[PDB]
Write an enzyme that holds these catalytic residues in place. Structure first.
Site, PDB file in Angstrom:
ATOM      1  N   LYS A  25      -8.182   3.915  -1.707  1.00 58.27           N
ATOM      2  CA  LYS A  25      -8.306   4.078  -0.284  1.00 58.27           C
ATOM      3  C   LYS A  25      -7.794   5.519  -0.329  1.00 58.27           C
ATOM      4  CE  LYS A  25      -4.640  -0.025  -1.168  1.00 58.27           C
ATOM      5  NZ  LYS A  25      -3.440  -0.632  -1.143  1.00 58.27           N
ATOM      6  N   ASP A  73      -2.136   3.187  -4.211  1.00 56.92           N
ATOM      7  CA  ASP A  73      -2.358   2.510  -5.311  1.00 56.92           C
ATOM      8  C   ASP A  73      -3.700   1.897  -5.250  1.00 56.92           C
ATOM      9  OD1 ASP A  73      -1.313   1.265  -2.487  1.00 56.92           O
ATOM     10  OD2 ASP A  73      -1.284  -0.636  -3.438  1.00 56.92           O
ATOM     11  N   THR A  91       1.151  -1.182  -0.026  1.00 59.35           N
ATOM     12  CA  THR A  91       0.315   0.365   0.354  1.00 59.35           C
ATOM     13  C   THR A  91       1.267   1.815  -0.167  1.00 59.35           C
ATOM     14  OG1 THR A  91      -1.417  -1.538   1.635  1.00 59.35           O
ATOM     15  CG2 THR A  91      -2.019   0.919   1.204  1.00 59.35           C
ATOM     16  N   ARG A 117      -4.041  -1.567  -5.220  1.00 64.07           N
ATOM     17  CA  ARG A 117      -3.930  -3.360  -5.096  1.00 64.07           C
ATOM     18  C   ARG A 117      -4.382  -3.697  -3.074  1.00 64.07           C
ATOM     19  NH1 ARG A 117       1.338  -6.103  -6.547  1.00 64.07           N
ATOM     20  NH2 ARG A 117       0.091  -5.983  -8.941  1.00 64.07           N
ATOM     21  N   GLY A 153      -2.728  -0.173   6.420  1.00 63.92           N
ATOM     22  CA  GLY A 153      -2.992  -0.444   7.688  1.00 63.92           C
ATOM     23  C   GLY A 153      -3.316  -1.801   7.640  1.00 63.92           C
ATOM     24  N   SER A 201       2.020  -2.894  -2.887  1.00 63.79           N
ATOM     25  CA  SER A 201       1.451  -1.962  -4.255  1.00 63.79           C
ATOM     26  C   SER A 201       1.658  -2.768  -5.649  1.00 63.79           C
ATOM     27  CB  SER A 201       2.388  -1.602  -3.934  1.00 63.79           C
ATOM     28  OG  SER A 201       3.680  -1.394  -4.511  1.00 63.79           O
ATOM     29  N   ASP A 204       7.336  -1.931  -4.931  1.00 66.99           N
ATOM     30  CA  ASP A 204       6.221  -3.124  -3.637  1.00 66.99           C
ATOM     31  C   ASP A 204       6.640  -4.113  -3.778  1.00 66.99           C
ATOM     32  OD1 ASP A 204       5.975  -3.381  -1.029  1.00 66.99           O
ATOM     33  OD2 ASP A 204       4.555  -1.970  -1.483  1.00 66.99           O
ATOM     34  N   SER A 232       3.668  -0.006   2.892  1.00 65.23           N
ATOM     35  CA  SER A 232       4.889  -0.971   3.004  1.00 65.23           C
ATOM     36  C   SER A 232       5.129  -0.316   1.523  1.00 65.23           C
ATOM     37  CB  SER A 232       4.364  -1.793   2.160  1.00 65.23           C
ATOM     38  OG  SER A 232       3.379  -1.959   1.204  1.00 65.23           O
TER      39      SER A 232
END
Lengths: 215, 239, 222, 240, 204, 202, 213, 239, 80
Positions: C33, C17, C1, C19, C47, C169, C166, C129
């Site tokens: 988000k 993002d 994220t 996902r 989170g 994400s 990452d 992340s």
């Protein structure tokens, strides 16, 4: 305090004829760091009683606040009654035990010293709440080091004079500085006499480092 | 009857007489308070009567500071007045803690007023017999004056009065607002003093009046010193 | 994220993002988000997803009661304090890390709220992340007093860096631009990556699947 | 008329009579006076000796509410002892939380708010005691505060409570107390206490005097018997 | 995991003007099948169905609890729940036990009461809502099913095609997971009618 | 973090590093750990940011309400005692070390240190936080009684710099504040302005 | 981490007799290897006809003695009579069980004269099980002291030896000797022995000196 | 009328008097008399017990709170039993917590606080037992009386109960002698003072007199029916 | 009869509670004091909800052989 934080070590007291003298180092150590070096670990509970503490300074500071108010309340009542050294000891024993029962221990181990009605009292209260009264008391590593010196003088001469007693505590404080890491040179001495409780300011110990060159 | 005697019971004509009786208490005090809102300033003036020479003049005040930038004048029973001021001060701080900005004056009146309705609806307590007028500066809406009465009404007013001569005071103020000239700080203070003086016919000396001001330039509520009050009073007499 | 936000000269641009991953399988793409706290305050969350959704919703609700009563648009600080105190009481059990962005009478304010109740008012913040990857882009290119278009590009580049760098994400990039005058919620600001064409048709013709039993119940449309 | 039965009720004319009725209680009690001079505050109570059997130096109407503050009470004694306890508890709390001796003005306010609460609810009667608190702190100065059964609290340069309050105030008024020093005031308080006492109605009185000030090092304390005796002599001579 | 103890698989798919929800039928304690007829898809409306997979006890409790809330809502508001609202009500029920969570992952599939637009959504243990335009899967075999679904699903599928895609996907997927299987029930919801068919599957 | 306060005659100079770190990642490189509890009482916060930020706000609320009711500027000792009670009562749950410094007309500039666990000790100079350990020697040697406010500002800056270089957790800009009867002057030292001490350069 | 208990050591002995009851104890309180005090008698006089002896965590002993003392007063006020030894034993049993979940680490022996005028010794486990026993040794040296009393007082394992009722004198001699033996072999016991003899006249306290370590 | 203002403890009368508290005070008069006197070394309580019938035993008028404190009840027995329990528990508490006999004065303050709460709050009736408390503490012998009104007084001597003015009169005339009196003399003086309360036909008997003595060396002891015989025999005949 | 049933019950439990706690038989006087304590509570002495507001309307004569031998105690609604 489940974990002790800033703590102090060794308060020694011995009963002279006509009073008791208790003496303490003025260092609160944060686990091997001498973080606080002018803290006073001896308090004047009342004209007849003084208490010193070894352990978390925080818990002592709380106990000073609670005990002090209890004394102030009796004075306002103005009935002419006052708390004897023995009484303050009884209360502390019940208090420390109560916190042990609740598994929220007060880490401090304390010496209650007082002269009332012509009889000197010196008592020990531990975090687990063990309490007893005895002629000379040393808390901390003092029990391991200082108490043997104090007991020997006392067994041979049961009654000691104020000058003799102050000298012994200075000598015992010297040993503790030499062989206990948590100790500090500056110490305060306080004596309960018929007159009252007087606490001497930073007093320091002359130290013999002669053995060093012996190597 | 017996329709009066409990706040909860409603009269056969639905009038909740006990609440009305409380408004009477404000008058029993015998003091009047006037608040006027200027273009840039809000002023609260109240009569200070000291009954005995022995009483310290400094202690007796009807002007209290709810927060640094909100000031209130409470008329009515003295004890009830102090109680409300504390609740206001608590409420004002609780807003800063919870919401992070100083309580707007309107919201303080609303909270204080709402507390009064609870007293008006619950049987055991008595409506506090006091009326509080709050003066503050809101950045968005400029100067603000609000009054909360024992009923729980919370209207905001351009100018208002509370006390024995409130009706007369309102009439004087009404004439002055109708001939609107806008009010500079001096005029806002002068209008207030002239109104209290004319209604009471007192011809006040600096000691008898307590005046508190909030200004856009200096937002903090300040209670003017006797000398400052005298200066305005002297000017009124001169012209 | 990767959730990230920047303060432009006249407002805030918030990026995230799309996902949502349960374990190491992408449970969903096109997840949103950037939550709405209030017309002037939008908050991006990372989170535990449920915690972010519920906390944002409770604060969105509380701020609506507050704005209705106050009669004035909610201030960003109120959102931060309400959020921080709630999080502090729960002692990090509610694992919501949020980037709260809004424009109020005071101006443009962006705050980052860690799960234990810590808050930071910052010119640029990234959380989640991919935050470390995103922060790199911000540290390298954030300039003070950026115009809105430049800012949208910086936030897009940063969420993009997280998407590629990452594992957690990845999907479309969403930007929300809050300005004193207006709010633009640009869902699908960019679709960085797209699924490839299915070369082979594996569609099953009728009768491919056996049926032991069948019951047809006719709903009464009316 | 049912308006006076409860404190919750308000009379049609706006007056809460039950509070006023409580204020009449203080007038039943004997006079007590407190005068604030530059050095400190001196309080005096005329304590009627109802019976020879009662021990002297007992049935005290002057209480120490904290090391630095003293309370003189008039009115139903039971309520007063209870109010004194509320005050002592408040003082302890201020020391425990804020870590210093309570400023008297605050103490008066906190106790007053407690007294006012009784005024509002119908379950509890208004307290029937009117009390004066005084303290001297170098920073604060000398402060005398009086709390009525209503909960009104104000600071008085000189104050009187009890049956002869009006008469005493006239005497206290002619004192120029601000200039006067603490030791001189003790004689003056006694003169006033003697003047107000009515020998015919009240058989006999023992003057109880207490003081707080620089001389007491900011501790409220009963005046030493030597000082009290000298004052009682000054008073009888002045009474002539 | 606790989720793996009873075992389950639920899937839903969105066609054109139709939705399909399909689930496995095995109830087993760890490794021993006890019954081959467990109900994991429960009707929550005329054209809205919920599928619960996870601990069986939770599947039964959350369905029974949701119905209590839903029945009262319908009686109080005199309206059938819109699909998005059930998802929210379910998310509230699950979040309420955020600490000590009911261990079920629900899938809700339905047609809007008036528009008849299809709605498919899934929620996690702590109650996080995910609305998807394609398919939603929950259960022990989620990885296996996600793959089968990604490839087979095609947009704007007709009802007959949707049944064939959901059946192929569930059958192939539960085959590669040990704890789910022993039969699959596909419910197809179209505005006019609901068709429920039990597929023929390896009973091993 | 390294937080240091020193009392100069008539006031206090509080200083702190700007780095807040989650693990080895510096989440915020410009944090302000010197917060205003009241107009002339500030606290330097070290320890868990969450706990410090909550306690700081709660004390701001309590001191403010008290000041309005007492209608007097609040006493620095009062602020310390409020912090001490909270930190002591919740010692098990809180991990915060706060240095409270301020100017009150009654007692002048005062610096009080609440170490973790809830102790209040007034100290002439107080150092706190992870970086404090490295500078205990510099402060003991450097501190001289009766330093001027300007001398203290330099002392605080040099001390905080030495810790910042030797502590990973400490870092960032140095924030320094001087609180006195006149008022609070807050300064931020960055880059060249941060004092630099020469490296060994073998 | 915090351990709520420590073994403060000590040993207690009680010997009943046809008309007398003797309860005796060490006077040393020892925490770990250190000797906290060499004068802390572990015998307390509850009433004229009863003495309680407690060994274990001293902190528990002090609290228990305070509780029993208070309850004795409450029985006196409410029932207008002194608690008998039998009653104190039953009350202690209940008091000890109250903390079955977080226990009092005290081994307790109550010795006293019963209503008939005979001497009774009641011995209690840390959780309150109580048995009336003719002789009982409790504490660190129970293991060392109990066997000897059993051979001498109980004439156990002795063949062709007559059974003679114990006399106050023989018992005082026996108590002094058993404690002398324990001082030598139990590190915890030592310093001094307080022997409390309860007889119709009342408790009499005699102190003898055992070896200082 | 004035029937109003007497119904509850919460209603203040128009002239400042709470009537129910006064009515409660009347209860002590209903009870049998008790006399308490003090000497520099001892404190004595003597009581005149009353019996329902010849067959019935005389009631207990003297009760032991603690070794150092004992009380004599005049008034409703129930209130006394309740207050005594509170006092006994407060004393037991001090010994457990501070290992000191509670100062007698402090206990009386506590009895006063408990007693006052019924007076101000609607609900429980004011306690209607009048109590004479006697104890020797470090300060010395102490005799205190407690009214149903919470007010308490320290007395050289006092008699509470029916026809107790007569006893107070005797005590006042012979008061000076009491301070230096021996214990026998002090109890004898007291027995005579209670004799005054008795009707002329009635005489002190072993059955109706109870004596309680506490002193530096004496724990509070209630000498009862056969143990009052030593103190009674020395007494003379009715004046 | 009804209020007696409650008072006889408090007595039965209190005699039994004494056996459990002290392994002895309560004297007639203590048992009367025990029932009396319940009777005295009618005054609203305690804050407990389950206490009858009305004074009990029963008088009990309690007779038993105790340590002091045969004893008869009479209790009245007052609780004396």
């Amino acid at each position: 305090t489940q974990n002790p934080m800033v703590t102090g070590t060794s308060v020694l007291g011995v009963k002279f004829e006509g009073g008791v003298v208790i003496a303490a180092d003025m260092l609160g150590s944060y686990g091997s760091l001498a973080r606080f070096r002018n803290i006073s670990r001896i308090m004047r509970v009342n004209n007849s009683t003084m208490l010193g503490a070894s352990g978390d300074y925080a818990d002592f500071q709380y106990l000073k606040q609670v005990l002090g108010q209890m004394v102030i309340d009796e004075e306002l009542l103005g009935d002419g009654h006052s708390y004897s050294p023995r009484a303050i000891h009884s209360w502390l024993t019940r208090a420390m035990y109560s916190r042990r029962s609740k598994m929220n221990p007060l880490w401090n181990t304390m010496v209650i010293g007082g002269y009332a009605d012509g009889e000197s009292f010196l008592g020990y209260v531990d975090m687990l709440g063990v309490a007893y009264e005895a002629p000379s008391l040393a808390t901390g590593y003092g029990a391991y080091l200082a108490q043997p010196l104090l007991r020997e003088v006392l067994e041979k001469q049961p009654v000691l004079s104020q000058t003799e007693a102050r000298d012994l505590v200075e000598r015992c404080m010297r040993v503790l500085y030499y062989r206990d890491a948590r100790s500090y040179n500056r110490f305060q001495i306080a004596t309960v006499t018929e007159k009252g409780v007087e606490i001497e300011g930073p007093l320091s110990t002359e130290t013999n480092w002669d053995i060093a060159h012996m190597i | 009857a017996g329709f009066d005697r409990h706040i909860t019971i409603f009269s056969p004509e639905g009038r909740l007489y006990q609440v009305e009786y409380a408004f009477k208490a404000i008058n029993q005090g015998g003091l009047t308070s006037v608040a006027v809102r200027g273009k840039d300033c809000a002023v609260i003036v109240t009569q200070k009567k000291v009954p005995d020479k022995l009483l310290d003049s400094s202690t007796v005040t009807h002007l209290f500071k709810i927060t640094e930038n909100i000031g209130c004048v409470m008329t009515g029973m003295t004890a009830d007045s102090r109680s409300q001021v504390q609740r206001a001060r608590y409420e004002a701080a609780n807003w800063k803690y919870k919401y992070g900005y100083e309580i707007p004056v309107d919201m303080l009146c609303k909270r204080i007023a709402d507390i009064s309705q609870v007293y008006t609806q619950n049987a055991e307590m008595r409506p506090l017999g006091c009326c509080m007028i709050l003066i503050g500066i809101d950045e968005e809406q400029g100067p603000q004056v609000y009054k909360c009465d024992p009923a729980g009404y919370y209207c905001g007013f351009k100018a208002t009065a509370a006390g024995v001569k409130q009706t007369e005071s309102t009439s004087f103020l009404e004439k002055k607002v109708k001939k609107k000239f806008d009010w500079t700080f001096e005029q806002t203070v002068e209008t207030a003093i002239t109104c209290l003086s004319t209604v009471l016919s007192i011809d006040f000396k600096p000691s008898e009046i307590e005046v508190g001001v909030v200004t856009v330039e200096n937002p903090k509520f300040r209670i003017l010193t006797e000398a400052e009050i005298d200066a305005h009073l002297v000017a009124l007499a001169e012209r | 994220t990767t959730i990230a936000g920047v303060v432009y000269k006249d407002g805030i641009v918030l990026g995230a993002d799309t996902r949502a991953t349960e374990g190491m399988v992408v449970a969903d793409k096109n997840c949103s988000k950037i939550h709405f706290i209030s017309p002037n305050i939008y908050c991006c969350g990372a989170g535990t997803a449920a915690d972010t959704d519920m906390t944002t919703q409770l604060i969105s609700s509380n701020l609506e009661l507050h704005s209705l009563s106050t009669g004035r648009l909610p201030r960003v600080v109120t959102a931060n304090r309400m959020l921080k105190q709630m999080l502090f009481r729960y002692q990090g059990y509610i694992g919501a890390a949020l980037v709260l962005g809004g424009v109020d009478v005071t101006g443009p304010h962006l705050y980052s709220i860690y799960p234990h109740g810590s808050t930071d008012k910052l010119p640029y913040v990234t959380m989640g992340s991919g935050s470390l990857a995103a922060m790199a882009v911000f540290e390298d290119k954030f300039r003070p007093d950026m115009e809105e278009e430049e800012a949208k590009n910086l936030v897009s580049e940063a969420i993009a860096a997280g998407i590629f760098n990452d594992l957690g994400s990845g999907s479309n990039i969403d930007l929300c631009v809050i300005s004193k005058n207006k709010l633009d919620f640009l869902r699908p600001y960019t679709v960085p990556n797209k699924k490839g064409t299915r070369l082979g048709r594996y569609r099953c013709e009728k009768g491919t699947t056996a049926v032991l039993t069948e019951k047809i119940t006719p709903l009464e449309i009316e | 008329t049912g308006y006076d039965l409860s404190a919750s009720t308000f009379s049609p004319d706006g007056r809460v009579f039950q509070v006023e009725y409580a204020m009449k209680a203080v007038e039943n009690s004997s006079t007590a006076i407190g005068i604030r001079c530059k050095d400190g505050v001196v309080f005096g109570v005329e304590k009627l000796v109802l019976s020879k059997l009662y021990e002297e130096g007992s049935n005290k109407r002057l209480f120490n509410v904290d090391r630095h503050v003293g309370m003189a009470v008039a009115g139903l004694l039971a309520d007063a002892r209870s109010l004194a306890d509320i005050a002592r508890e408040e003082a302890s709390n201020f020391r425990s939380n804020f870590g210093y001796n309570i400023p008297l003005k605050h103490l008066a306010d906190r106790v007053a708010m407690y007294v006012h609460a009784y005024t509002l609810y119908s379950a509890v009667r208004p307290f029937g005691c009117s009390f004066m608190l005084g303290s001297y702190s170098v920073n604060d100065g000398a402060q005398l505060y009086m709390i009525d059964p209503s909960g009104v609290s104000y600071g008085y340069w000189g104050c009187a409570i009890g049956k002869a309050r009006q008469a005493a105030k006239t005497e206290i008024e002619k004192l120029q107390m601000k200039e006067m020093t603490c030791r001189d005031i003790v004689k003056e308080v006694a003169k006033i206490i003697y003047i107000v006492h009515d020998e015919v109605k009240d058989k006999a009185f023992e003057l109880e005097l207490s003081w707080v000030g620089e001389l007491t090092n900011g501790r409220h304390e009963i005046v030493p018997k030597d000082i009290r005796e000298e004052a009682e002599k000054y008073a009888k001579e002045s009474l002539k | 995991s606790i989720m793996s103890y009873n075992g389950g698989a639920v899937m839903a798919m969105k066609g054109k003007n139709c939705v399909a929800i399909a689930a496995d039928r095995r109830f087993g304690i760890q490794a021993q099948m006890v019954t081959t007829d467990f109900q994991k898809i429960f009707p929550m409306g005329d054209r809205l169905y919920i599928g619960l997979a996870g601990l069986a006890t939770d599947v039964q409790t959350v369905a029974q609890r949701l119905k209590f809330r839903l029945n009262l809502y319908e009686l109080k508001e005199g309206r059938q729940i819109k699909p998005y609202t059930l998802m929210s009500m379910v998310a509230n029920l699950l979040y309420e036990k955020r600490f000590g969570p009911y261990y079920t992952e629900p899938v809700i599939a339905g047609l809007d009461p008036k528009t008849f637009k299809p709605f498919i959504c899934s929620l996690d243990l702590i109650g996080c809502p995910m609305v998807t335009d394609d398919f939603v899967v929950s259960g022990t075999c989620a990885e296996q099913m996600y793959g089968m679904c990604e490839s087979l699903w095609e947009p704007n599928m007709d009802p007959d095609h949707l049944f064939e895609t959901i059946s192929q996907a569930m059958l192939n997927a539960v085959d590669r997971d040990a704890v789910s299987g022993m039969g699959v029930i596909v419910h197809i919801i179209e505005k006019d009618k609901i068709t429920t068919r039990t597929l023929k599957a390896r009973m091993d | 973090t390294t937080i240091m306060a020193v009392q100069f005659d008539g006031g206090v100079v509080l200083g702190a590093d700007s780095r807040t770190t989650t693990g080895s990642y510096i989440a915020n490189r410009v944090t302000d750990k010197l917060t205003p509890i009241h107009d002339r009482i500030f606290c330097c916060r070290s320890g868990s940011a969450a706990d410090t930020q909550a306690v700081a706000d709660a004390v701001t609320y309590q001191l403010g309400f008290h000041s309005i009711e007492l209608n007097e500027p609040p006493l620095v000792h009062t602020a310390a005692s409020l912090f001490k009670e909270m930190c002591y009562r919740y010692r098990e749950d809180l991990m915060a070390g706060i240095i409270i410094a301020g100017w009150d007309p009654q007692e002048g500039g005062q610096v009080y240190s609440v170490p973790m666990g809830g102790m209040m000790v007034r100290q002439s100079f107080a150092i706190g936080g992870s970086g404090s350990s490295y500078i205990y020697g510099y402060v003991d040697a450097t501190y001289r009684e009766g330093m001027t406010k300007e001398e203290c500002l330099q002392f605080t800056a040099n001390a905080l710099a030495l810790a910042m270089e030797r502590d990973g957790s400490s870092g960032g800009v140095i924030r320094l504040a001087a609180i006195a009867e006149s008022g609070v002057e807050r300064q931020v030292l960055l880059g060249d302005q941060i004092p630099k001490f020469a490296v060994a350069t073998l | 981490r915090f351990s709520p208990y420590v073994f403060n050591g000590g040993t207690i002995l009680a010997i009943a007799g046809e008309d007398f009851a003797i309860v005796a104890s060490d006077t040393r309180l020892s925490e770990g290897f250190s000797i906290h005090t060499r004068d802390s008698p572990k015998c307390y006089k509850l009433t004229d006809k009863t003495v309680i002896g407690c060994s274990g965590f001293h902190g528990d002993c002090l609290t228990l003695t305070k509780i029993i003392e208070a309850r004795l007063k409450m029985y006196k006020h409410s029932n207008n009579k002194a608690m008998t030894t039998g009653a104190i034993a039953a009350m202690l049993s209940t008091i000890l069980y109250s903390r079955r979940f977080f226990p009092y680490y005290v081994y307790n022996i109550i010795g006293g004269l019963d209503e008939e005028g005979k001497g009774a010794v009641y011995s209690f486990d840390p959780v309150g099980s109580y048995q009336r026993d003719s002789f009982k040794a409790g504490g660190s040296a129970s293991a060392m002291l109990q066997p000897l009393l059993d051979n001498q007082v109980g004439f156990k394992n002795m063949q062709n030896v007559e059974h003679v009722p114990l006399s106050l004198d023989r018992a005082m001699r026996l108590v002094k000797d058993v404690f002398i033996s324990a001082a030598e072999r139990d590190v915890y016991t030592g310093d001094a022995l307080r022997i409390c003899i309860v007889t119709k006249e009342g408790i009499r306290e005699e102190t003898v000196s055992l070896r200082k370590d | 009328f004035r029937n109003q203002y007497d119904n509850d403890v919460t209603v203040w009368s128009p002239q400042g008097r709470i009537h129910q508290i006064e009515y409660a005070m009347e209860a002590v008069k209903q009870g049998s008399a008790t006399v308490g006197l003090k000497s520099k070394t001892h404190a004595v309580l003597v009581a005149l017990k009353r019996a329902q019938s010849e067959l019935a035993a005389h009631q207990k008028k003297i009760l032991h709170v603690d070794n150092h404190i004992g009380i004599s009840i005049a008034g409703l027995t129930a209130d006394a039993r309740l207050l005594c329990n509170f006092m006994r528990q407060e004393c037991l508490d001090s010994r457990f917590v501070f290992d000191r006999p509670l100062p007698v004065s402090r206990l009386v303050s506590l009895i006063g606080s408990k007693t006052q709460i019924p007076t101000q709050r609607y609900g429980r009736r004011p306690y209607g037992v009048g109590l004479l408390i006697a104890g020797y503490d470090d300060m010395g012998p102490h005799i205190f009386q407690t009214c149903p009104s919470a007010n308490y007084f320290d007395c050289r001597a006092m008699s509470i109960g029916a026809r107790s003015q007569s006893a107070r009169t005797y005590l006042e005339r012979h008061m000076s002698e009491f301070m230096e009196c021996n214990l026998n003399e002090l109890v004898k003086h007291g027995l005579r003072a209670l004799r005054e309360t008795l009707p002329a036909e009635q005489d002190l008997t072993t059955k109706n007199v109870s004596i309680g003595i506490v002193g530096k060396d004496l724990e509070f002891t209630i000498y009862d029916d056969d143990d009052v015989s030593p103190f009674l025999e020395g007494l003379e005949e009715r004046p | 009869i009804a209020d007696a049933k409650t008072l006889i019950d408090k007595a039965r439990v209190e005699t039994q509670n004494h056996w459990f706690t002290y392994n002895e038989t309560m004297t007639v006087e203590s048992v009367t004091q025990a029932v009396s304590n319940l009777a005295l509570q009618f005054g609203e002495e305690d804050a407990d909800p389950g206490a009858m507001s009305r004074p009990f309307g029963v008088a009990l004569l309690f007779g038993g052989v105790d340590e002091k031998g045969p004893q008869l105690f009479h209790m009245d609604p007052s609780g004396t």
